[PDB]
Ligand binder design. Structure first.
Ligand SMILES: Cc1nc2ccccc2c(-c2ccc(Cl)cc2)c1[C@H](OC(C)(C)C)C(=O)O
Lengths: 140, 149
């Protein structure tokens, strides 16, 4: 799997929306609770992702938040190729994420915090996805 | 010099608060406009950072937001040690970030957007000529080496 390809999807919990980004080649994940599943929030999420990791292509679930012209603008600016409707086949990752969230939920006063704790655990769990993504992306 | 050392601080622009984190060894930056400089926002910022990179130690100013019970709980949970030499780098980035923001501010309505655009531009920018690297390449390279050593 190309090192610049990310799978973009969503998942819901406690009446809240979580945007999920998975680095297909490593299984590394980035996720965050967002106010609403809108194009503006999705574009912002993508701009942050692209500025922290090499994002060359995103495969989305083709939800209306992704078909949004606002997201298209963000992708064009960041040089991201958007491919909608491409199923994840390296979400079952959403299940894993939800499972970990449950293991740390009572340690956080807010879901948003628990989600980040779950991402941390997932990425550092043993080679870990975190170690894998850096080894794959490293240029020198 | 260690790959797990980060310097954090804040900067103000347009009456808003920006939390900035710099990976000392690489110059790689993470920043974001936050509602207010509170302990809650700082802890959240830190947890997101720690889940992405191997944050071992953070050098911050002495503001109340960095020493709140929730920030300590977050650092405790993530295994992060809290500690002008330990702020000179991030302070330099505050200016560098502000400089880039001013160059693309017209390309976005909200400051929060321009901030992320600036972060992108800074981290992807190749330093030097042919043979040079970007800050984003440096942090990845540094960590990859540490993991395989
Ligand atoms: C409000 C907004 N509206 C838009 C409507 C149509 C197309 C693009 C945008 C962008 C836009 C502009 C530049 C890029 Cl690179 C990406 C999106 C923003 C953007 O806010 C976000 C980022 C919070 C949605 C901003 O602050 O300007």
């Amino acid at each position: 799997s190309s090192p610049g390809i990310w799978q973009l999807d969503c998942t819901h919990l406690e009446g809240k929306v979580i945007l999920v980004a998975v680095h297909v080649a490593s299984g590394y994940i980035e996720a965050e609770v967002i106010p609403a599943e809108t194009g503006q929030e999705t574009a912002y999420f993508l701009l942050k992702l692209a500025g922290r990791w090499p994002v060359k292509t995103i495969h989305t679930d083709n939800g209306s938040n992704f078909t949004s012209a606002t997201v298209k603008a963000a992708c064009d600016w960041a040089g991201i190729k958007q491919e909608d409707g491409i199923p994840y086949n390296p979400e079952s990752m959403n299940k894993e994420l939800k499972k970990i969230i449950g293991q740390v939920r009572d340690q956080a006063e807010h879901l948003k915090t628990a989600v980040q704790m779950a991402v941390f655990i997932h990425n550092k769990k043993r080679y870990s996805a975190g170690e894998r993504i850096v080894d794959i992306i490293a240029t020198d």
